[PDB]
Design a protein around this ligand. Structure first.
Ligand code: EMC
Ligand code: EMC
Ligand SMILES: [Cl-]
Ligand SMILES: [Mg+2]
Lengths: 93, 92
């Protein structure tokens, strides 16, 4: 199949300004990388916004929680929260 | 354009995990700050993605160009490029 969304998201964030001959080209390449992650041909506005939120949520998690969440390959913010809440539940019981 | 979207975007990016009492509330607050920046009630899908591209383009500029472009508050990627093209021409 095609690459996992996370490969696309990383390529979008890892593209470097000196990778293209000038700003017009850089902006064109970024657009193309961003479409391949956020997939506007298949996702609604709401689904896109959810992926943008999820990315930032992962970015701000303390390291140990971040690794755990990452390993669960979440596709939205609810999935990310529930895998932390599953630990917390099992500790509170 | 307006100096305000940069405000809401920086608030979305600067929000810290310790500012919420827990993960559910953290993600809830992120959704709201995200919506304040990307304004889905007034922007199309295509317009939202231009704001995501614009943020990454400015993020990859070297330090002074980054400050220069930021201070001109471009509303999209095309506008950011023109800012750099206008500067190039004022320096040559
Ligand atoms: C649904 C996250 Hg702006
Ligand atoms: C505006 C193309 Hg991700
Ligand atoms: Cl919730
Ligand atoms: Mg709680």
């Amino acid at each position: 199949g095609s690459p996992d969304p996370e490969i696309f998201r990383q390529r979008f964030r890892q593209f470097g300004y000196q990778d293209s001959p000038g700003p017009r080209e850089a902006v064109s390449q970024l657009r193309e990388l961003c479409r391949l992650w956020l997939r506007p041909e298949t996702h609604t506005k709401e689904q896109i916004l959810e992926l943008v939120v999820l990315e930032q949520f992962v970015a701000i998690l303390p390291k140990e929680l971040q690794t755990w969440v990452r390993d669960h390959h979440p596709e939205n913010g609810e999935e990310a929260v529930t895998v932390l809440e599953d630990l917390e539940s099992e500790l509170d019981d």
